[model samples]
Structures are given as C-alpha cells and as structure tokens.
Target: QNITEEFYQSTCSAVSRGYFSALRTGWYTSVITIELSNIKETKCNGTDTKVKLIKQELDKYKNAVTELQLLTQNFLGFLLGVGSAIASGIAVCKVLHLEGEVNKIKNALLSTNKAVVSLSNGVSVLTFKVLDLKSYINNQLLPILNQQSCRISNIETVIEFQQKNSRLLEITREFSVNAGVTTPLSTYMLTNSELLSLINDMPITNDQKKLMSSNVQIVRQQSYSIMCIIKEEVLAYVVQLPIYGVIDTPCWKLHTSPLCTTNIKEGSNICLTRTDRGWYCDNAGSVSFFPQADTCKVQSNRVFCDTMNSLTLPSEVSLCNTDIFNSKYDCKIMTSKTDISSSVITSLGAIVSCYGKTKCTASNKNRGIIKTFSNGCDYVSNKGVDTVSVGNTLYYVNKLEGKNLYVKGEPIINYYDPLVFPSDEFDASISQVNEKINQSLAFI
Candidate 1:
C-alpha cells in the first residue's frame, strides 16, 4: 500500500506515439517498448500502474492529433476555395479579413504541440496529469499532442499589398482618362501656363505640386517637338483674320504666350518666340482648349497656322504689327511674298516706287499716330489723316490707324505717346528697320 501510495503520490506521465501506421490504434499486440523512468526508480506495485493509464491517455492524445490534422485539412480547403474566389475578384477583401481564423488554428496546434513535447517517459499520471481522466488525473501529467499543422506564411503580407493597390486603382484610371484626350473624353488638354494656375490651387503636398510643375515644363517641350515634326506643306496659313460663325476660338499659330508683354487686352498684340526648346506659349491658353492661334496683323486681331509657316491671314490682317514705339523705329517680318510690281502700285492704280495714294482721298490728313504726340490718333484703324509742316500750309498726308498713304503709296506715320512710348528702342517699325522683304518676293 506504501508502494501504491508512493507511485500515485508523486507524479505520472503517459504517451504512445505515432500509430495506425505508428500509433497502430492497437499497440496491444505485444509491447515493443514501454518506458519506465523515475516511476520504477521510486516504487510501484506488481501491476504496471504506468502502463494502465498509458493506453487510456494515449488514446486521448491520438485523438487530439487527429483533431489537429482535421483542422489542417479544413484550413487548406478554406484557403484553396478562397484563392478561387479571389482569382474571380469576388473575394478580394473577404479572404484576407478571415485571417483571424487561420491564426486561431495555428495557435491551438502550437499549444497542443507544446503539451505533447513536454511529456515524460510513460509514468503514472503524476506531475503533468491529463485534466480529464478517469479516477487518477492531476497536474502530474498532461496529454501528449501534436503541433498546429499550418502557418499564416506570407498570406498576411500579400493581402496588405493587395489592399494598398486596390486603394490606388482609381488614381491610375483617372490619370489616363484625364490626360489622354484628343477628342471628347469630356477631358481635355490644358496649356502648361494654364496648368500652372491650377497646380497652385490644388490641395496636394508641396512635393507633389513641385513634381507636377516640373512635368509641366516637359509638356511644353513635347508640344514644341510635335509641332516641329509637322511639315511645312501640311501647315495652313490663316487667309482671313476670322470666321464669324465658329464655336471655339480660331487657331492662333503666329503668337501665343502666358508670358505677357504688358497690359494684355483684346487688342494687345502677342508674339511667339521659338527657342532650341519645344513649342512654348506665354498666353493663358492651350493648343486647343485655349484654341491655338496667332496674330498676323491687328487690323484683324488674330490669325492662325498649323506650324512651320510663313504668311497667313486675310490681307486685311496680313500686315505685320510693325508699330515702332520709339522715333528710332523699325519695320520687319520680311519675306519673299511681294515684288516690284506689287510694291510700286498705288491705291490710285499708278506705278510708283516708294509710296502712293488716290487722286482724291479723305479731306483730313495728318500723322495721327506719331510716337511723339497724341493728335487724337487713338481712334484710327487705317489710312489715317494728318497735317505736316510744309511752311504754314500744314502739308496734309492721309493717315489714320498708322496707315500713311501719299505720293504713290506713302503711308502717313501715326501719333500717340500715351504711355510715354518707350524711351528705349523696343520698336520694330519701318522707321527703325526698312526691311527689303518685297525686293525678293512675288508680286500680287
């Protein structure tokens, strides 16, 4: 009884590993090896008390392992099924959201594995007893069990990336839609100068704003590059200054720039200067959205050409805006489009070399737009009227709007120094530069 008390008093642990193939399900054939440790080292009755509890508890441990395996097989089935759903797009978020279940199974397996790993040689249920065992069970023994059979692996991280990519998917779609329009995607191109205004107003970070600004510069360059690729033969010069019944603004080829000269208004003349860089504009508009255009002459405000061009616009606006602001003036934009025959013919149908006028013209004649004086020339449009100093007779020269017509076709110089006419030489009139463009040009 002392021996029985001794064996039962201290501790007992029981385990029988791998069966069916290993656990055999029935190890009752003949004991291959039944372990005996500190149990026999201490005391025991003739009947192996350790072996008695071994099969009972071993059966439970095997049951636990079988439960763990079932959890594994079921876990895999869930993942495989979810993978199909995710591939079909229906389970994108749902599969990942169920991560808690996978982790739970993994943790249970781990705990079971630890319990199994912590077992001792088959001792009577002692120090680590199974919690629910018949008659003899305590902290002395614990059920031997297998490990959790699965891992979360990289699945968690994969879902993280998928979530992030899905979040930004809309951004990708919008960029292509907004930027890829040559027609009515309902989206359109904004000139860089116009884009500049919008960038400042956007609610993006400073870094993103700057990045967009840098790209704007590139956009301007691309437009210019594309313009160059267009052949001269393909370019269309504006014959008339305008078409009355149009929907949008006409093409402005000659001049465009957000870079204002000064005092920009309806009548303000603009210019486009091509550099080594791509086509660029200084105006507050686009290649189309701003209605690409140019100004051949102001008698008609604007005319346009495709690109790589020379003369374009109706004769009314074909003349260059060569108003020389300073007295030391100039006139330029020479080309081979005129000849001696065309140049020397006066409005009165005479053959004159330098300038001419009709036999009977407007009674009032004077230099109305002379840079030095106002002379009420502000209201003139063409062939202005003005008086000159031929002694006290006031030599009259028919001129207005700066059109000074005389002897043959002499255009009377104009007047007006309202803004103090630039003290410097910012002028490009014939006075400053008598361009002999007609000398090498064809006659009308």
Candidate 2:
C-alpha cells in the first residue's frame, strides 16, 4: 500500500503526543527519584549497629532509584528518536517521497512502543519498590528505630542512676568516716575489701563494727538493687513490648486509671484519695471505704485526668475541671502521702541528695522525705498535692482529698512519641509518575 501525506501527518501527530507524555513521565520520575534519595539521606540516627543495617536497606533503594533515573534517560532517548523520525516524516511528506520514509516512520513507531513499554514497566517496578521501601520504613525501620531509641534511652537512664548511686555511696562513706572510724574514708583510697578491713580494725566494740560493716554493705547493695529494679521495669515495658503498647502512666493517674470506676453511686463528686487507694466521696466526713476495682457511672460533667492512651477535656463536664499537665519526665516520687504509690519511691528522699541538701524525717511512716537532686526534686504544690520536678517538665496534678502532692520525673523509662516517616511526599510523586506513565501508554 502506498503511504499518503495525510497518513504521514497523522502518524507524526500521534508520535508527538506520545513524546509529550513521555517527557512528563520522565520529569516526574526524576523528581520523585531525587526526593527518595533525599529522604534516605535524612539518616536513621540510631545505635551504630542498627543504623548500619538501616543504611544497608536504604542503599539498596538508592540503587533502585539510580536505576530508575537511568531508565528515564533511556525513555527520553527513545523519545528523541521519535522526534527525529517525525522530522524525517515531514521531509518525506514535503518531497512526496514515501518508500524510505515509510519504513523509517514504521520503525520509529515500533521504537515508540518499546520506549513506552519499557518506561511503563520500569515505573511499575519502581512503584512496587518504593512501596516496599515505604513499608520497610513504617513497619520495619520505624519500629526498629523506636526499639533502638528505647534501648538507648533506657541505657542512659541506667547510666544516670549509676552516677547518682555513686554519689550516694560517696555521701554514705563520708557519713561513716565522720562517725569515728580509725581511718578516714575520705582521706584514703579503699576498695570494697579494704573498706571492710578498715571497719574490722576499728577500736569500736564488735557489735558497732559489725553494724558499720553492715551499713556500708547495705548502702552498696541498695544502690545496685535500685539499678536492677529500674533496668527490669524499663526494659520490660519500653523495649520488649510492642511500640504502641508501652505503659507510660504518670503518677497522678496510676491510682484511679481508666476512669475512676467504683461501686459508689453515680453523680457523686467522687474524689481520688491521698492514699491513692481508689475514688471515694466524703461519706459523712469519715475518710473510709474506697474500694479497689470498683466502677463509677459515667458523668459527663465530672472531670478526670488524661491517661496515657486518651485525653479528657474539662469543657465536656459541668462543675468538673481537669488540671491537665504535660511533662517530658517519666518517673514519679511521693507527693505528700497519698498520691499513687507504685510510682513513688518509698525510700527516704527518692534518691537521697548527694549534695546534702535533701531533708529526711526520723521515720518513713509519714511522707517523710523531701528530696532535691541536681536533676530532680520533690516539692509540695500550693494545692497541697505532692509533685516531683524534673527540670522544665509539666504534669497534671491529682486533686485528692488529702494535703499531699506528687510529681513525675524522667528517671527510668524515657517516653518517645510515635515516629514520622515522611512518606506522603514520596507517595504523591510516585502516584503522579504512574498517571503520567498511563498517559504516555494511551498515546501509544
């Protein structure tokens, strides 16, 4: 069949349409590839070992991105061939020559098919690759980052506790030395064995030396025990548990958590007691009968503190106002006497002040410790509730019936909010590339 000028013109127009679509596809693909590379460059920023693993995965994607970039160039080259074929077709149309130009235009059309198919497939492969990469970040990498963060933060807390314990040991040694031991502990270097030897050689009676030796050992053992406790609790909840399941309840809410549900009649002004035993109303002015594991009817007007899992607003309740507090701290000490005690350090003065500034009472019966360390402290709020202070953190105070207040601190488990992966931008760009691919294929 003879090729006509009209056929040449129409075929050229089709190739031109394909060329434009392919151009847009190439442009968007390049943009998205660059964006993906930039994201990888953001750095995983975790433990060295974990970061290396993350970078390995990211490097794999980098190669995929580079391959896509190369494919775009190939796509554009094929487009160039189509453009040149269109110019040659025009020349043939003008000269009214069809034989060589017809074969050339046919070859260009075949080449256009190859270009469109290759790009479409390439973009498709990259799309899947990007999706897998995104999933790796969200499902795998992000959680790994969180675990690494939890591990690192818990390790930091361990170090902080150790340092504080060492300070306390120093304070204890000074106290013991001042109490008339022959060799001044402060004046000489003493290992654990030497400390025992010095105590044994003291001029004091057998019982006194025994007591002093016992005290020193107790002090050392107590600090190590505390460290063990912190390590056990923190690792179990923060690092071992699922990322979403970390139990980070603050001190105030630990008592009546999950909405103070008690057998008390609904509509009563149920107040959390200083004992932190449970929610109770002043039934005839006798502070008695607050049950554990009781349920109170839901009152829309009654205010409650926000729990780790949800937030409550005071505006929702009439006559009920929640004292909301936000804090970066994750530990707690005794607030007066009755705030939640699980988080409370029952030992005198949380971690006794190594600087000798903390106040301790004669006995532990009454909320008798007021601890203030360089990094944290315990203080009573004007509202008569106990509060712990850890630098510039905030916390919602519990309004209990008693005069004691408690505060939260960042001692054991450091809380990290959910991570953001910045996947939206890559998603949008990949979607555009896919649409452009479709457009180019349609022209073909």
Candidate 3:
C-alpha cells in the first residue's frame, strides 16, 4: 500500500503539476501573444525603420504562438495518456506480485519519457520570441511613440491632435491600472520567487490521475476560448488607435504685397469676402480687383445656369409635410413629356419630355446646379423653396411624399490644395491590418 501510494502520488503529481503549469503558461503566453499582435502600428512607431521592425517582430511572434499551440496540444496528450497509463499499470501489477509486467511497463515508461522530453522543450523554445516582442515594445516602440514626430494624430489640425493625444494619454494611463508592470504575461519574464510561489500554491492530489486520451480536445477548446477573448479585447484597443494622419506643421508667414497691405474701412468701401468661386473686391456701387484694375467678379446665387430653359406650373399641386424640422409648408411638382415643336395645342399634363432635362450636370462649389422638373428636384423634394424659377419659366414645387434622395461623394477639397497623403496610400495600412486580424481568426 505504501509503495502503491508513493508511486501513484509521485506520477500523478508530476502529470497534474506539469499539465496545469502548461495550462497557465500556455493561456497567459497565448493571450500576451495575441495582445501583442493586436497592437496597431499607429501606436507603435511612425518612422519607416521602426515600422518595419514592428512588422517583422509581429510576424515572428505569430509564428511562435502557432508553434507553441501545436506543442501544447502534443504535450498535454502525451502527459495525460502515458503518465496515467504508467501509474495505473504499475500500481496494479506491483500489488498483484507480477514483477515481470511491472518491469515491462517501467521500460515502456522510459522510452515514452524521452518522447515527452522533446515535446516539453518545444513550447519553451518558441516562448522566448514573445519576450523578444515584449522587450521591443518596452524598450523601443513605446519610447518612440512618446516623441513629437511619432505622436499619433487622426486629424492634422491642432485641436484634433490635442484631443486625440488626450485620448491616447488616457488609454496608456489605464494600462497601468489594468495590467501591472511585471508578470510573466506582462513582462514575459518570470522572477524566481514568483515561480517558487506558484509551484508551492498548486495543490497535488494522491488519487490516480485518469487518462484523458479521449478528451484531448477539451483543453484545446478551453484555451481557444481564452485566446478569442484576448483577441477581441486587444482588437478593441487597436481600434482606439484610428487611421493615422499627417502631423500638424507649424510655421510663420508674413505677406508684404499690396493685397495684404491695404485695409478697407467698413462704411467707406465694402470689403467683399472671398466666396467659394474665388477672391474678388466688389460691393454695391463700384468694384475693382485685388492688386489690379480689372472688373470685380460676382458669383450668381440663382439656381439656373443659363436663361434658355423654362417650366410650366400647375394650379393643383399637392402639399405635404416634408420639412424635416416641420418649420414650414411644402408642395410637389409633377413632370410629364410634351412637344412644343408642332403646334400651340396643350394639355395640363405639361409638355416636358421624361428624357428632356433628365440629365444632371455634375455639381461643383464654384458653379450652380442645372436641374429640371423632368428629373427629380431636391429643392422641391426636400420641402425646400416652394417656388423656384429655372431659366425663363416659373414652376410651383412640392415636397415628394414618402420619398428620399441621396447624392454621395468623397469629401471635396480645393483643386489646388495640397493633399494630406497620397490618394492611393490613405488607409492602406489600416486595411491591411484589419484583413490580417480577420484572417488570424481562422487559425483560432
């Protein structure tokens, strides 16, 4: 009984202790691995060299975790199956006085022990790569991010930079509270005392540990769940770092030209403000160009582009409450085909072709919209101006009931303005990272 108890305790204790140790270490290592992968390059480094370093480290870290996962699966299966089999086999044979069977099982254990040793070293080998990454983040990545040139900004303006910097500061501040400065998981290095304490704290049982040969996948699924959670949370942190943009460039400029020198008095000569069309110096009475004697230009605010078109109004136009704010009255304009080419004869259906004026000129800030009643009109559709004259004719308009229109376009900037980044380069890294993260889910 004493021999059996001692044998079972020793064998079961190693299996239990090692399995749980692997469980804890594997769980924490994988979590840290996934968390490191989830960090956006925006938060890491801004320069080319540093960015490439982060990329290289992350790729190597991913390979390490994948290798670690494979080894963990193999180790647990071997430890449980062989460890349990040896303990049970020896305990039964020794009690039965079958010395030959006990000797046979002991020899099998020695052969299997060599196999287990090889598998145990695999996880240990790849685990150091995670430390490489953690050290890079602590020693290089975070330090560079703290500087002005590498400061993260989603918007190039001063207020947006300051606002996002404040947000970034808060994010880093919370990390200290949530994750400590030291731990195998955080620092990727374990102190000797921590190892000693953790080993001592884990309880060892004397009962024969059963072989989990049929349930190898159980621990795998368990670890997988934890990794998914870590991936999700770390991804959420990654999202906090938005698509980065150019840093604000500070400079000072003073104009010495007559255009900047001359200042107009309020009542004496009206200072015409710059419009979307361009700059000009014009008022009610007389006009002159800035720094020149050319005639001052005025941008026409009327909806019509030219004076050749006209519309026919109907007396019985329907009214509806299309105003989003409900602050004003609204009505609609119905258009149908007509030919004034042949004769003067007319019907109330109106003489506008369904195809006539159906075409829309692409819009511009410096130009007016050329729209006809034959095509849908937002001026009348959105409960806008009740009566608008385009070209030479008048038309009574009404808001189209239960109908909406949308015109989509990229944000418009001045044609001459310098772009923040290359047109094709914007969000490319962000898109790549998003795709990589989604692909990583398949491995999980």
Candidate 4:
C-alpha cells in the first residue's frame, strides 16, 4: 500500500510540473507561430493575388483561342461532307445514261439496227464525258479546293499561336507594371519624406509618449488605431490566405534612442570630393553618402518614425479626457526635430537596390514596399531587431482579394549604431555584413 501511494504521488508531481512548464512557454511558442504564420500568409496572399490578376488578364484571351479552334473544325467538316455528296451524284448520272441507251436500242430491232448502233455510240460518248467530269471533280476541282482549305487551316494555326503568345506577353507586362510601378509608389508613400514629415508633425503631448511606454494597454489602443487605418487602406486590397490582416503592437523602445545611422567610419568612406585642381577624389571624405543610401536609408528611417509616431494619442483627445488626465498627467508639446541625435538609438543595417518607376515614362517599375515589410518583419521577429537593409527594386504580390499588389524592393540586413563599436573597422565590417545580408535575402 505504501509503495503504491508513493508511486501515485510521483506520477501526480511529474504531471503537474509538465503542465506548468507547457503553460509557461506556450505563449512564446504561440507568438512565434503566429508571426511565422503571418509571414507565410502574407507571402501566399501576395502570390494568390498576382495569380488572380494574371488569370483575369488571361481570361480575356480565351475567346480568341476558342474561335480559331471551332473555325478550323467546321471548315474541315464541310470539305468532307461536300466531296462525299458530289461523288455519289456523279455515279448516279453514269448509271442513268447507260440505261437510256439500252432502252432505245431494244425498240429498234431489224430496221433501225444502224440507228441502234449509232445510239450505242452516242451513249458511249456520253459515258466518256461523264468520266471526264468525274476526273475533273477528283483531280482539278477537288485538289484546288483541298489546297485552299489547307492554306486557310495553316493561317488559322498561325493566328492561334500568335494569340496565345499575346496573352503571355500581356501577363508579363501587367506583372512588370504592377510590381514595378504602383507597388513602389504605395511603399514610398509609407516611408516617403513628405509622409514622414506629416507624421512627425502631429501634435502629441509628452505625457502621452511617457504613458505609452509604461504598459501595453495604451500601446494596444494606439496601435489598434493605426492598424485599423492600415487595414482600410492597404489590407483591404490583399486577397489570399490567412484572411485577417496584421495588427502590430507598439514598440516601447522607439522613443528611447536615435533611430538612423549618422556617423561613417574613415576606412569605409565611399564619397568623392572635387578639388580646385581638377582632380576627382575618391574616398576623400570620412563619411560618404551614395545616391542609393540617401534615398533608401533616409526613406526607410523616416518611414519607421512615421509609423511609430502615428500611434501616439493626439493632444486634443487627451486634453479633452479629464478623467484620463486625473489618472496620470504629464504633458508636453510634440517637436518636429528631424535630427537623429536626440532620438532613440534605432539601428540601420545593410543596403540593397530595388526597382522603382522612372519619372519620365509609365514603363517598368518596382514593388519594393512589400519586400521591405516582409523582410523587416522577419528580421525584427526573429532577431528582436527593428531595422533591415533593402534595395530599390520593386516586386508585386497578390492582394488579400486576389489582386496584384506591389511593394518596394530592398535588401535585408542587421543594423546597429557605430557608437557601440567606436572602431575604424566597424563601418567596413558593417558594410561587409550588409553585403552578405543582401546576398542572403536575394536567394530568399
């Protein structure tokens, strides 16, 4: 009895501990699963949307294919049917001629024997004419008719081939246009200088920013507002798997640091300066700003700031709520400080080139935004980092409603401030690291 009781107690203890462990770690696993699922869902949704658009375009070409096929079949059938009827008619005509000659001779007997012979000869001539007619129909007319029919059939085949090819060309064009142009525009709007300025300019009291940092409750509320807006403008257009859109929680660490890369190392300098002596200097400056970096990095940093700043509660709303003010009141006006020095230390990692539209014409464009979002979300969720590098190329993905969606193309990377390392080689190493990241993302 004692042994049995001890065994039972041990089993109970093990079961309880196992249950508790699962409970404790379950949230993290669930969160990771949710993040991964969201990423996959976004990708799938994008693909489906693109396919739907392509399918829609393809649907337009179906009629052409069908019409050509039917025409060919009907034309062949008519040729066969007409030839068969003509052959049968000639045979019947020959038999009638023979019968008429035999009947005429039967009545002529002795007195008209010569006449009978003449009649027989005339009948023979008639039979020969009939044979000639049959030959003409079989050799001359029939061959000509068949040749004409075959030519028409060949023409039809060519037309069908061209039509099929046209559809493929159209698909390629639409993919290029959407993935390249419209998508990049939308992505640019999210992180564009003007849009970032607009968000940064929004009036927020200091009290609200502080309040938001303390807990997830207010963060959820503000984040939900932005999430709702994003859903309305962006997610509504997406058409594919994982029907629901994303609702990101506010990052508490955003306001605590400088978010953009400011300093450059002496070794990694790529900027050129012109001397009065007509000499072009390469790597003359301690820090260099390349065109790619200026446009993409600035754009990315501004976008991050705008997205974060938009979640803050407006001063008017907070001021109107006296009850909330009584709860905890600390208020200050929002500032439009563009400089990164006063801001929290948010890292900017590697750089990549993405496709974008040329201002000159409405031709090929890039879908850079979707790529950035996908890559950024992956880096942040996996590595617990906020920044990643991207390129200028754009790509298109399927929307939630199964339509083509576009995004800016950028490379993915890990970003951190140089202040942390303070070594001359740090910048060079970071650049190398960024290059590796670009290669990695390219494969993905």
Candidate 5:
C-alpha cells in the first residue's frame, strides 16, 4: 500500500481503540458507539460533528503526501543538469591550458630561430670587414711602407758620401792656402802640405840659387798635393758604365771632340784615360794603346803621342754642332771639312728657324748636352780659375745667399761618433735625402 493509505488505516484503528477505552473507563463510550452505528439518523439530525471532523483530517494528510512526492522528483532533475554543466566547464579549461602551453613553446622556438639567423649575419659581416682590412694592408699600405724604407736607405748612403767629400775638400783647401804647397809628395803630405812647407821655407839668407832651389821644391810639393787631391776627388764622383764595345768605345778618350762622329772605326779605341788639362782621346786609331798613361808626348809635326796618352783639351761639348766645330778645329780645317761645316750650319739654321714659335723659346728650347768629366771638376772649375774677390764675397753675403757659410760652420760628424743629430733636424734631413735618393733610383 501507499504511505497515505497505510497512515489512514492506522489512524482509524487508533480512533476505534480510543472509543473502546473510553467505554471501559465508563465515560459514555457505549453511547458513542451507538451514535457511530446510527449513520442515517446522525445525518438527518446533524449531531455527528466528531465523525465529520475525523474524515476531513484524513483528506488533508493525503494531499500533503502527494505534494511531497512531486517536489522530490523536480529537485533530482535540477541536480543532474548542474552536474553535467560543471563537468563540461572543467574539460574546456583543460584544453585551454594545453593550448596556452603549446603557444608559449612555439614563441620560444621562433625567438631562438631569429637569434640564430642574426648571429649568422653578424658573423658574415664581420668576416667581410676583416678580409677587406687584410687586403688593404697587403695591397696598399705594405707597398707604400716598403717604398719609404728603400728611399730612406738610399738617402742615408748619399748623405754619408757628401759628408766625406765635403770634409776632404775643406782639408785640401786649408792645406793649400796655409802651406803654400802647389803639389803633394806623399798622400799624407798632400793633405797637410801647407804646414810642412812653412817649416821648410824658414831660415832665409841662403844664396840666390839655393833660395831659388828651395822655392822650386816648395812649388813642386804644392803642385803635387793639388794634383793628388784633384785626382782622388774626381775619381770618387765619376761612375763609369760599360756600353757595347763595338758601338760606343769604353770611355777611352777623356774628351771626345764630336760625340756623334761616324768616322770612329770599330775596334779602334777601347779604354779610358785621365789627363791633367781634361779628359783626352788616348787611342784614336790604334788598338795597341789599350790603357793610356797620364803623360802626353810632343814630337815633330805629328805631335808624336805619349806612350801614356794625355792632351790639353776642354771637357764640355755644346749640343750645337757649329759650336762644337769651332771649339774642336782651327778656322782653316773647319772650313775644309764639308760634313763638319754642313752639320754646323744645319744646327744653326734649326735654332734660327724656331726663333719665336710658341713651342720654342730660349728658355724652353731643348739644347740637350752631356757634360762628362772625371771629378765633375769641369763643372766648377772650367772657364778660368774661379775667383772669389773679397768685394763679391761681401756682396753675396749681404744678399743673404751664403748657405755655404752654414755648411762650413757645421762640420759633418763621422758615423762612428756618439753624438746624435737633433730629432727635428734629423727627421727633416732624412725626408729631403729620401726624396733625392728616390729620384736617383727612378733615373737609373
């Protein structure tokens, strides 16, 4: 049975029991039973109110049980829906968390890739720069540095030679002026003849002949000293290079008259010789006289040449053939030689032909000539004796053109000396000398 029915039955049973107990307790229970049994009379009389109240109570209880059952079912259904929603929400959250982790990892990987690419590019750029720097050093800077070093070396050599030559010249000039010695006897005496001659010339009062003899001796000594100094100094500066033996002779003649003479036969002259006056033609037509000596021979008519060929001649030759001819031959012989005459006129004509042309001026005209001499003595001492009069010397000094004075004041210190040149001066001199050496090398 349902709960409501069971409760109703129990309540009715309790009510009956209560009625019997009341009757047993002698509280009008019999009367009540009698009334309960007479239902039709009670309905007509309307006096059975207790029975009606009891029936009403039973109906109320049944309604309350039905409502409770309906409420329980609704509550269960609501709880089931809430559980499903919560489960679904939890699953979505898990998926979102997993996705977030994956995204973070991807971002990290991308950053790493970019870093690697950047590093590689940086390395490439650095490598390129380094290689460029190396190439610049090797191709450009290194060569320049090497050229500078070579120039400096050559300059040092030239400076040393100049210093030595200058000192030697000064010594010779001093000895000549002081000792009254014209020639040198020995190499040592040549450098200091003036001091020696002064000592020997003392003690006057000798006979005229003896005095004459002493003077001769002094002159001879002075002359010897001068000659020795000249020869040595000349040799120091003159450098000879060998040309084709068959074409241009071996510098045999100190002074060759016509530089472009075709008449000079092959195998005729082959050796070089030095002379006091100047350089001379030693073996003009003889191969037998290979090495000519330092003395000239004077003989009948033909000027029988010295075994040691020497002649008095000017060393310089003008480029103009006419000047050369006039300098080489007397007027009669010059007029007779047609080749010589024609060359002279032709050269002169050319000079006159371009008198005012834009390209040819006195300054611009190329009158190229070679000045070959043993000691470069011809350059400084050619025309006559060079005279430095006190007046001219004073004039030049007043004009402030006395650089030689500065040179004379500062004598060259030898290489073996401990004194060092001042830094600034040394550097300047080095730069100047270096330029000169480079120019010489280029010429060579």
Candidate 6:
C-alpha cells in the first residue's frame, strides 16, 4: 500500500505559509488552491517570495517594475499605445464634428502625443509590440463581423477562424473584461477628456473660451478626414453595442456566449443579430447550437428557456482546440442535429477528441474513469456524421450514445475499463513522508 519517492518532496503553493511564495514546480494555472506544498520559485528566476506579501502580489511584480522604469526613460514606450488610443479618440472626434478651431484640434492633440509614437493606419503594416491591442481587437471581431451584426462563438468556430487568420488570441476580451461592456469605446476615453480638462484649466473668459472652442473646431474638421481614413483602414469589426443610447454596434461577445431570443426575459438586450449560426455563436458555452426552440433556428429542438442551461466548456480551458481541449467537459454531444433531436449530450467528462481521434489510441478506450458533477449522459463516439439534414461536414460530429468506449490506454474509456496504471502520485509521496516520520521517531 506504500511506495515512495527517493528525494522526498511534496507539491506546494508556498515556500512559506504567509510569506514569500511561488508557483508549484510545473503548473501556472489558478484553480483557487495552493495545489502543491513545495512552491517552485523560477518565476523571478531565483528571486521570489515577498519579504512583504503585499509587495509581491502581482503576477510578475519585479519584471513589470523594471519595465515601468525603462518606459519612464523614453516617451516612446508611451507612444506604443498612442496608435490605438489615437484611433479611438480620433473616431469620436470625427463623429462629434466639432466647430471651427475645435475641428483642427484633433490633429493638434495627435501632434501633442506623437513625441512618443509613430502610428500605423492600415492592415498589413508590421511592428513589434508588447501589447498589440489593436490587432487582437480586430481578430476578436473579424470572425463573425464577416457576416452582419451576428457572429458564432463556439470552440471550433473561434479556433477555426483564428487558425486561418493567424490572429492575436487576445482579441475583444477588453470589451467585457472591465464591466457592463454596456458602452462603446467612448469619445471620453484616450486623452480626449484630458484635452477638454486642459481647456477648462486655462481660466479664460467667456469670450476667450468661445475663441478657443472655435480654434479647436478647425482641428476637429482636419482630424475628421484622418478618422475616416483610419476607419477605412481598420476594417472596423471590433464594435461595441451601446445599451443606453441605442444598442447599435454588433457584438457577439463570442467566447462562451448564450443563444436563443426566447430565452431572454423582457429587459436583457443580449441578442446582437439573429442568424441561426450567427447568434449561435455567443457570450459563453462550448457548444453554440443547442438544438431546441432556438430564437433563430425556431423549431430546431424543444422549447427550452435559455440556451446557457445546456452543455458548456470548462472555464479553465481557454481556447477550444479539440485536439488539446485539455480539460474535461460536461456538455451533451447529440449524435445528430436531428429534426427529431436526440437526448441532450448532458453527461460530463472529457475526451474532446470525441469527433477526431486524439493522441489516445483505441487501446486507451477502457482506461480512465470519466467522472462528472452530476450523473448525466455519457457521450461516446459514433465517429461519423450526425443529422440527415444537409450535405457537407458542417454540422456532423460523434454522437453522445455510449457509457463505455474502446478509447485505447484510457483508464476512463474501455481501453483499460477500470484499471489505473499506478494508483496515484499523492499516496506515493505520503509513503515517503511517513518513512521520515518513522525514522525520526527514534529521536523522540
């Protein structure tokens, strides 16, 4: 019952309980626990653990501080951000169409900032950057923007789009990352308000105020052209939908989104567009098209309330690459998008390689035990097409129809059915700890 390690080590989240701490030896995930007890300290590279805990709270506190110091050197570091900031600011000003001197003020303000950066206007232009915020924003929206206001946000949909385009994975997350995601990239952001504040501080009379306002209108008119120029160049897909004024710009909020309009109560304005597959892409959920009374696919399945109640991907697994889905899922895998939609693919577990054969061989089929939060359905592979609905391989995937599968070498699947290769690592480690405890018993 007891096997042990030679070196005698343990998993740790901290080298200390409340003092300097580091990540465990081989993982960088954040699962709300101190997964290990022997925290690995290569992060700061031999310089970890906060002498003061609060001082070392950041993900990379030291690296960021040094980088900040470097940035304070040349204004150029500030300039790196100038391009995107200027884009949003200029767009707002162009829309405002300020009068007189205010018209030309956009350029003056842009010029004011350029001591720091050289901005780019069109696609295909290249540069090195730490946070290429602009490109990622574009990548996030482009997948569905190719359509109308609607977009699809499923694991495969996003991965397929990103893979083909070679886009920045960071796209569009900022829209919802902060808050209500309720508004647009406002006119108030990116130094626009700061410039207005500058005018307020000038202490001018009403007459002079009128004059300054007049002067700035000129800059606005001049900058309006540039705004339009960049608007054309940016490909404009990363649009925000305003909930207050008018929810105009189309945003699918693609990553793990909900589908179906009937699911909405009377006040939630979540629908971006109504393409069956368009809005089928969503704010959250691994599988987008839940076959039910879809607001778009109308009679696709039963009249379920909200689609979010259906299957979904794990929050830990970031992207939806089927090959390396990495984490387990608890969603249903209906064999077909049947007119008579089969039972839900509700039982949870993993093997995202449901459709395509992953690295696991048929030998692993009877291996690992597939467990789930609730006792639901077990999805196995038909390893073929689903639905007699249409032609191409568009909606085909393995059906969720089995409790046991011949997944080679997999202890969960039929590969090894119920045999676990070696019981586990924890017990082995525990045995070693006991040996030391037993040996030291003599000291007592």
Q: Which number leads on lDDT?
A: 2
Of candidate 2, the 10-residue stretch with the lowest lDDT total is 14-23
Name the weakest run of 10 consecutive residues (lDDT summed) in model 1.
Answer: 1-10
Give the alpha carbon lDDT tens digit for every residue of 236-271 in model 5.
100010111121121221121111112223322111
TM-score of 2: 0.14
For candidate 1, what is the TM-score?
0.16
TM-scores, one per candidate: 0.16, 0.14, 0.17, 0.15, 0.13, 0.17
- lDDT (10s digit) by residue, model 2, range 219-248: 222111000001100100000000111111
Q: Candidate 3: which stretches are off by over 4 Å?
A: 1-37, 40-51, 65-191, 204-444
| Model 2: residue 97 alpha-carbon error in angstroms | 33
lDDT of 6 at 98: 26
Q: 3 or 4, which is superior by TM-score?
A: 3
Residues 358-380, model 1: lDDT tens digits = 12122233433232211111111
lDDT of 6 by residue, 1-444 (tens): 011111001100000001111101110000000000111232222122221221132223233223322322331122133223124434433332323322232333333321111133221111111122233324653334333333344545444433422322122222224321212233321124433443343333454334334334322222211111112112111121101111111212111111111211332211111111112222233323322332221111211122222223344222221211123532211111111111221111122111111121111234432221111112323333232111121223334433322222211111111122222212222233334445566566
Decide which is better by TM-score, 2 or 3.
3
Q: Quote the RMSD, in angstroms, for model 4.
A: 35.3
What local distance difference test score does each model get?
0.22, 0.24, 0.22, 0.21, 0.21, 0.23
| Candidate 1 ranges beyond 4 A from true positions | 1-159, 162-168, 175-319, 323-444
Of the pair 1 and 4, which is ahead by lDDT?
1
